[PDB]
């Protein structure tokens, strides 16, 4: 049986989409750029901060220096961090708490494999820190998803090889990263985004100990 489970944060344990959106919109409003609405915000989901900022600047053909760019990105981040102060245990996705409990009582290791610079903070706010045997520090990895680095680091951090592990993810790039680490991927979402050569569940309520075991057995 698998010895560890490697969790992504956003889209698996929780998300902070309403807060990211609110931060970008506030920044657009502040600098006077029209068009940053819910619909357009879709084009920023999963995109880096710099690339999101550029897409927003592009709505007004607006041109800025390096320092101005850096400052606008900082301001969007400052907004975002203020907004996430209200993350609570109610933000935990369905099934996840029970899953973490079952994993722990069966002595299966639990690690975070997230690019989020606010991972430890967010796990504290949701009261999940005591379940986590480790958190891979995204600052200490050479390359981000779909590079496998972070899943490799997560597995190693809990004393296992990736090949002893299951990875859970909601993004194509994350699925590829788990694949290339050597761990077994189980996605949440749809085959159109994730691929159809991996097991996928519709939502996180389907992530149960019992189910991960059947998947490991096949
Ligand atoms: Mg994700």
Per the DSSP assignment, residues forming a β-bridge with 186 are 168, 199
Q: Which domain holds residue 24?
A: 17-85
Find the CATH number of the domain harbouring 47: 1.10.150.240
Distances (CA, A) of 36 to 71, 81, 190: 19, 19, 26
Q: Structure resolution in Å?
A: 1.9
Rounded (5°) CA angle 193-195-197: 165
32 CA to middle of ligand 1, Å? 31
| Two structure tokens written together for 206 | 């389907």
145 CA to middle of ligand 1, Å? 10
The phi and psi torsions of 149 (rounded to 5 degrees) equal -30, -55
214 CA to middle of ligand 1, Å? 23
Catalytic residue annotation: 8, 10
In the block, tokens 């606008």 appear at 72
């Amino acid at each position: 049986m698998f010895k560890a489970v490697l969790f992504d944060l956003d889209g698996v344990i929780t998300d902070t989409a309403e807060y990211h959106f609110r931060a970008w919109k506030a920044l657009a409003e502040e600098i006077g750029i029209n068009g940053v609405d819910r619909q357009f915000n879709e084009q920023l989901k999963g995109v880096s901060r710099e690339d999101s900022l550029q897409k927003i600047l592009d709505l007004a053909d607006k041109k800025v220096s390096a320092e101005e760019f850096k400052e606008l990105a900082k301001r969007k981040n400052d907004n975002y961090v203020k907004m996430i102060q209200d993350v609570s245990p109610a933000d935990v996705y369905p099934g996840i708490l029970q899953l973490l409990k079952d994993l722990r009582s069966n002595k299966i290791k639990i690690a975070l494999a997230s690019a989020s610079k606010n991972g430890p903070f967010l796990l504290e706010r949701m009261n999940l820190t005591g379940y986590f045997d480790a958190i891979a520090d995204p600052a200490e990895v050479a390359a981000s998803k779909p590079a496998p680095d972070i899943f490799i680091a997560a597995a190693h951090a809990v004393g296992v090889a990736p090949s002893e592990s299951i990875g859970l993810e909601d993004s194509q790039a994350g699925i590829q990263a788990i694949k290339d680490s050597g761990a077994l991927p189980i996605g949440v979402g749809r085959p159109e985004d994730l691929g159809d050569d991996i097991v996928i569940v519709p939502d996180t309520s389907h992530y149960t100990l019992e189910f991960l075991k059947e998947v490991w057995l096949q």
